C-alpha cells in the first residue's frame, strides 16, 4: 500500500493472503472471503497451486490466529483476457471450510449490479509492497477516491467502465501497489472492487475490477 | 533458493502483483538464461508470445543490480554479452513491452 | 568456448579468470605484474570488492598450486558506452604484483593503430560454456578462428569459424584473442546466440587503445 498507515489488527477479518506457484517462481496476492469456504480475488493471481492464509495480521509470524488452507479450485473467469487484464476476477474454493470467528468471516458483495459513484471515498487494504524496495509484514490500508471514468479512458488503453472502476486522485501518493492484487475495495463495508492494475510507477489513477458486474457469475460459480 | 522480484508492463498497464523469479542462490548465469525467464513470465503473466514481442514497437527489460547499477536490454536486438552474471547480485527486474 | 579443444596445461601463462563466490564469470589477460585487462561490461554491474583475480589456472574445479590470487584495488575505463558496446575495455590494478614464472606471465600487445585484416589466423580461449547448453569448462579451451570484416564494425574485431558452429560463449567476455603472438582482441559480445555459424563474434580492438593501456601500466 502506497501512502497508507498500518491497519488495526484484525479490523478487516475478510482479508486473504495468497501464495502462488508459477512455472518460474512465486507470486503473492490478496483476496477476500465472500463465503465461509470461498475467496474472491483477481484472475491474474492464478497459479497451478495456491496456499491461502486467513485471519492474519503480521503475515511473517506463525500466528495462533491464522488458518492455513490450500485452494481446492482456482476458478478464473471464462472470459479473462491475460493481455488486456479484462474480466480479472477469480474465485478460490477452499479445500476445507474455515472456522468463522473473531478474525475470520466474510465481507459482503453488492446487491445486484451497482458499481459506484464518482467522488466516493473507499478503502483498499493488503500486505502488498509499500515502495519500490520494501514490503510489509502487516496488513496496511489507504483511503482512495473514485474518479470520473474520463481519467482512465485517456490513460489506459483497455479500460472498460462497464466492468471496471477508476480509482485514485492523481495528485496524492495514494494507491494499492505490488502485492495488493486481488484485495477488496470497500465502500460501506461492501467489496465493490478487486485490485487489478495501474501504472508501474504507482501514479494514480488505477483500475479495479467492478465486482457487481460479475454478480451472476459469482453466485453461479459458488453453486 | 533465492527470489528475484520482477514487474511486467504491457501496453502501458502493469498488474499489481508481486512476482518473483526463483534462482538457485549464488549461481552464475548468462543473459540468454535471463532472457528466457523474461520471455517465460511475459507469456504466463500477460499472454505475450514471441510473435507478439516481434510485432511490438519496442520491447526490453532492465536488470537492477544491488550495487545501484542497472543494465537495459532490448529483446529485439540480437546482441548479448558473453558474461556470466551472479543470481544473488540482482535486486529486481523491470520488464517493459 | 564452443567447438574447441583443451589447451596444453599452462600454455598461455597470461590467461586470467575473474571470480566471485560462485566462481568464474569473465576472462582477463595479465599485461603487467600488477595490472590485468578485461572487458568493461564484465565489471560494470559487479562489486569490485569481491572480484578475485586468478593467475595461473588451468582446471577451475581443482586446487591448483600454480595459482595466484589478487583483489582489484582500482579500475580504469576508457570511455565505456554500455548501450552501443563501444570501448568495451577495462584495466584492473591488483593489490600486489605477480611472481612471474612458467605458469604466470605477461602478454604482449600490438602497436597503436594496427588493424587486422580479413583472413588473419588467430586463437580464442576461455573457460566459457562449452556449447549453448552445458556449463563452464574445467580445463581451459582454445579454438582456431579467422578475423573477418563483413557483418562487423570498424570499432570491433570480429572472428568466425567457417563451415562450423563454433565461437565464444558465455563466460568468455574479457578473454584474449591471440593473433601473431599478440593480444589483439577482448571477447565482448555475440549475436543471435552462442556459436551461430552465421554471425561473427565481437572483440574489443585492443590496438585502438594501446596508447591508453601503456600510459596506465607504464
Amino acid at each position: 500500500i502506497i501512502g497508507g498507515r498500518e491497519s488495526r489488527p484484525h479490523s478487516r477479518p475478510y482479508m486473504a493472503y495468497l501464495q502462488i506457484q508459477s512455472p518460474a517462481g512465486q507470486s503473492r496476492c490478496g483476496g477476500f472471503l465472500v463465503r465461509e469456504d470461498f475467496v474472491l480475488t483477481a484472475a491474474h493471481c492464478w497459479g497451478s497451486n495456491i496456499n491461502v492464509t486467513l485471519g492474519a495480521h503480521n503475515i511473517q509470524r506463525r500466528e495462533n490466529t491464522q488458518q492455513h488452507i490450500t485452494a481446492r479450485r482456482a476458478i478464473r473467469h471464462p472470459q479473462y483476457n491475460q493481455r488486456t487484464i479484462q474480466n480479472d476476477i477469480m474465485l478460490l474454493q477452499l479445500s476445507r471450510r474455515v472456522r468463522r470467528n473473531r478474525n475470520v468471516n466474510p465481507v459482503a458483495l453488492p446487491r445486484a449490479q451497482e458499481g459506484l459513484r464518482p467522488g466516493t471515498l473507499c478503502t483498499v487494504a493488503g500486505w502488498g509492497r509499500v515502495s519500490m524496495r520494501r514490503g510489509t509484514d502487516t496488513l496496511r490500508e489507504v483511503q482512495l477516491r473514485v474518479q470520473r471514468d474520463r481519467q482512465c479512458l485517456r490513460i489506459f488503453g483497455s479500460y472498460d467502465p462497464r466492468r471496471q472502476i477508476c480509482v485514485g486522485d492523481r495528485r496524492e501518493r495514494k494507491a494499492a501497489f505490488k502485492g495488493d492484487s486481488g484485495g477488496p475495495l470497500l465502500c460501506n463495508n461492501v467489496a465493490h472492487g478487486i485490485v487489478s492494475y495501474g501504472k508501474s510507477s504507482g501514479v494514480p489513477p488505477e483500475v479495479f475490477t467492478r465486482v457487481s458486474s460479475f454478480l451472476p457469475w459469482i453466485r453461479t460459480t459458488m453453486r | 533458493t533465492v527470489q528475484v522480484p520482477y514487474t511486467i508492463t504491457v501496453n502501458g498497464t502493469s498488474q499489481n502483483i508481486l512476482s518473483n523469479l526463483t534462482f538457485n542462490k549464488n549461481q552464475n548465469i548468462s543473459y540468454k538464461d535471463l532472457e528466457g525467464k523474461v520471455k517465460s513470465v511475459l507469456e504466463s503473466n500477460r499472454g505475450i508470445t514471441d510473435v507478439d514481442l516481434r510485432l511490438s514497437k519496442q520491447a526490453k527489460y532492465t536488470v537492477n543490480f544491488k550495487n545501484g547499477t542497472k543494465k537495459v536490454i532490448d529483446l529485439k536486438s540480437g546482441i548479448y554479452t558473453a558474461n556470466l552474471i551472479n543470481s544473488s547480485d540482482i535486486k529486481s527486474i523491470n520488464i517493459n513491452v | 568456448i564452443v567447438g574447441g579443444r583443451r589447451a596444453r596445461p599452462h600454455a598461455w601463462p597470461f590467461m586470467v579468470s575473474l571470480q566471485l563466490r560462485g566462481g568464474h564469470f569473465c576472462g582477463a589477460t595479465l599485461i603487467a605484474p600488477n595490472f590485468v585487462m578485461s572487458a568493461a561490461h564484465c565489471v560494470a554491474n559487479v562489486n569490485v570488492r569481491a572480484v578475485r583475480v586468478v593467475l595461473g589456472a588451468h582446471n577451475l574445479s581443482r586446487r591448483e598450486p600454480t595459482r595466484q590470487v589478487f583483489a582489484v584495488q582500482r579500475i580504469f575505463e576508457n570511455g565505456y558506452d554500455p548501450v552501443n558496446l563501444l570501448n568495451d575495455i577495462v584495466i584492473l590494478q591488483l593489490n600486489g604484483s605477480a611472481t612471474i614464472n612458467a605458469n604466470v606471465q605477461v602478454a604482449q600487445l600490438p602497436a597503436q593503430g594496427r588493424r587486422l585484416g580479413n583472413g588473419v589466423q588467430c586463437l580464442a580461449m576461455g573457460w566459457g560454456l562449452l556449447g549453448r547448453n552445458r556449463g563452464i569448462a574445467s580445463v581451459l579451451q582454445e579454438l582456431n578462428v579467422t578475423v573477418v570484416t563483413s557483418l562487423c564494425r570498424r570499432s570491433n574485431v570480429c572472428t568466425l569459424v567457417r563451415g562450423r558452429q563454433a565461437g565464444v560463449c558465455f563466460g568468455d567476455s574479457g578473454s584474449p584473442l591471440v593473433c601473431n603472438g599478440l593480444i589483439h582482441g577482448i571477447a565482448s559480445f555475440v549475436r543471435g546466440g552462442c556459436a551461430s555459424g552465421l554471425y561473427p563474434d565481437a572483440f574489443a580492438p585492443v590496438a585502438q587503445f594501446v596508447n591508453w593501456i601503456d600510459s596506465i601500466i607504464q
Side-chain angles (χ1 to χ4, degrees):
Chain A
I1 295 294
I2 289 179
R5 291 186 200 170
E6 179 182 327
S7 289
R8 157 153 307 281
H10 306 279
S11 60
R12 302 189 176 287
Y14 34 84
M15 297 307 298
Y17 176 84
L18 316 174
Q19 298 167 73
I20 300 137
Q21 181 53 49
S22 296
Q26 296 145 346
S27 297
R28 287 153 50 196
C29 280
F32 47 111
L33 202 74
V34 297
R35 198 151 76 182
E36 293 93 327
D37 61 330
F38 269 108
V39 160
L40 194 61
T41 188
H44 67 256
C45 295
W46 182 92
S48 32
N49 180 270
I50 298 175
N51 302 342
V52 177
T53 308
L54 288 317
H57 183 76
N58 195 328
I59 202 55
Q60 295 296 339
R61 285 191 206 180
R62 321 158 162 78
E63 283 178 320
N64 31 284
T65 64
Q66 306 169 357
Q67 301 183 33
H68 303 255
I69 323 189
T70 73
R72 188 67 169 161
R73 284 196 191 105
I75 323 148
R76 293 186 287 173
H77 190 280
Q79 273 60 45
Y80 162 58
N81 196 331
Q82 232 175 14
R83 336 158 75 83
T84 57
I85 317 183
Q86 198 56 272
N87 300 302
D88 197 10
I89 178 173
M90 174 178 68
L91 277 166
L92 297 180
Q93 181 184 55
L94 303 188
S95 62
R96 71 196 209 272
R97 285 175 55 75
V98 319
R99 272 195 174 177
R100 281 194 77 130
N101 46 44
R102 297 185 163 190
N103 304 328
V104 174
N105 69 278
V107 70
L109 309 176
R111 302 127 30 186
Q113 327 292 22
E114 185 41 31
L116 215 34
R117 181 153 179 263
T120 300
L121 308 184
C122 303
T123 289
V124 57
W127 300 265
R129 309 289 282 184
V130 304
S131 61
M132 289 280 192
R133 274 184 282 165
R134 238 214 63 210
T136 172
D137 308 305
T138 44
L139 179 80
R140 308 182 85 248
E141 73 178 50
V142 67
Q143 208 177 44
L144 307 175
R145 180 173 154 143
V146 185
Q147 297 281 308
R148 166 76 190 100
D149 295 321
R150 63 151 198 166
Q151 309 269 133
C152 291
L153 275 161
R154 298 176 164 164
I155 300 303
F156 302 107
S158 288
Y159 177 71
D160 182 17
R162 255 196 62 263
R163 323 193 179 204
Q164 288 151 309
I165 314 178
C166 185
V167 169
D169 243 312
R170 177 193 46 237
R171 331 136 174 165
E172 299 175 321
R173 316 163 16 247
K174 300 178 179 308
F177 197 47
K178 301 313 200 266
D180 292 334
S181 275
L185 172 79
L186 301 131
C187 338
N188 295 345
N189 298 310
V190 172
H192 282 259
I194 311 179
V195 178
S196 188
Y197 59 96
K199 290 301 186 227
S200 48
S201 64
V203 165
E206 62 180 338
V207 190
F208 287 62
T209 305
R210 198 189 286 285
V211 179
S212 71
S213 298
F214 304 84
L215 273 151
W217 172 92
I218 294 159
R219 299 293 168 177
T220 291
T221 298
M222 301 179 301
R223 182 220 296 159
Chain B
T1 70
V2 289
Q3 303 296 327
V4 179
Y6 65 89
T7 73
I8 304 193
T9 294
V10 172
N11 295 310
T13 72
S14 163
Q15 293 159 358
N16 273 329
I17 192 169
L18 182 53
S19 284
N20 298 288
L21 294 168
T22 304
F23 294 103
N24 305 304
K25 190 184 185 287
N26 215 235
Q27 164 196 64
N28 282 351
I29 71 176
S30 91
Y31 281 95
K32 262 193 210 183
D33 307 317
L34 216 51
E35 188 206 61
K37 308 193 148 309
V38 160
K39 278 189 183 182
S40 179
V41 301
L42 260 175
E43 215 282 329
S44 88
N45 273 118
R46 284 314 277 278
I48 289 298
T49 55
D50 258 4
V51 29
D52 293 317
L53 278 167
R54 295 190 187 211
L55 293 183
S56 71
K57 290 187 177 175
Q58 52 109 356
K60 75 178 203 278
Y61 63 97
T62 305
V63 183
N64 293 311
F65 299 87
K66 295 171 164 164
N67 69 355
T69 74
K70 59 162 205 183
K71 171 123 217 158
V72 179
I73 287 145
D74 180 358
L75 293 155
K76 324 168 100 262
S77 144
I79 298 170
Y80 23 71
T81 271
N83 192 31
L84 282 173
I85 169 200
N86 201 290
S87 315
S88 300
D89 288 332
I90 306 178
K91 197 178 74 53
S92 47
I93 293 200
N94 304 130
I95 309 158
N96 215 293
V97 176
Chain C
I1 301 286
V2 180
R5 48 184 183 271
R6 289 170 156 80
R8 269 331 208 103
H10 303 109
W12 310 106
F14 47 79
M15 192 52 193
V16 181
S17 173
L18 308 177
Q19 305 195 354
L20 301 164
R21 243 308 154 193
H24 167 92
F25 71 92
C26 272
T29 305
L30 193 57
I31 59 168
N34 69 324
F35 280 101
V36 310
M37 173 178 79
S38 191
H41 66 243
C42 276
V43 314
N45 316 114
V46 303
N47 181 19
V48 185
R49 288 177 167 174
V51 173
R52 305 191 175 174
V53 188
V54 183
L55 309 168
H58 184 247
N59 183 324
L60 295 183
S61 295
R62 298 148 79 94
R63 257 209 200 180
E64 292 180 302
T66 74
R67 281 175 174 155
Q68 287 165 61
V69 183
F70 302 81
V72 185
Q73 167 184 328
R74 185 166 169 197
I75 82 187
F76 305 81
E77 299 188 352
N78 182 39
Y80 177 43
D81 186 344
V83 157
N84 296 334
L85 302 191
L86 289 180
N87 315 126
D88 193 348
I89 175 169
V90 75
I91 287 165
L92 316 169
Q93 186 174 349
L94 314 173
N95 73 315
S97 286
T99 290
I100 300 317
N101 49 47
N103 303 323
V104 178
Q105 302 194 241
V106 165
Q108 301 188 32
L109 269 48
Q112 177 66 41
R114 194 186 132 164
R115 186 189 289 268
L116 287 175
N118 178 81
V120 176
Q121 282 308 95
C122 298
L123 201 81
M125 75 188 51
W127 288 270
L129 272 42
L130 291 163
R132 275 188 298 270
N133 318 133
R134 233 183 329 196
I136 83 147
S138 279
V139 166
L140 187 68
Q141 318 265 323
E142 69 181 65
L143 172 79
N144 274 61
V145 308
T146 294
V147 169
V148 302
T149 37
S150 76
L151 311 183
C152 196
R153 295 201 276 206
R154 291 272 294 174
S155 54
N156 274 108
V157 175
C158 292
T159 76
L160 206 26
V161 173
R162 283 186 284 264
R164 300 175 53 210
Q165 293 189 11
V168 304
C169 199
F170 304 107
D172 292 326
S173 275
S175 298
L177 180 74
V178 199
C179 312
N180 312 133
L182 312 175
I183 298 304
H184 258 270
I186 305 176
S188 169
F189 63 90
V190 309
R191 274 178 272 186
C194 285
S196 83
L198 183 47
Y199 300 96
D201 307 340
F203 295 82
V206 187
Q208 302 307 323
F209 308 119
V210 155
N211 281 335
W212 179 77
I213 303 173
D214 279 353
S215 86
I216 303 164
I217 62 181
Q218 267 90 355

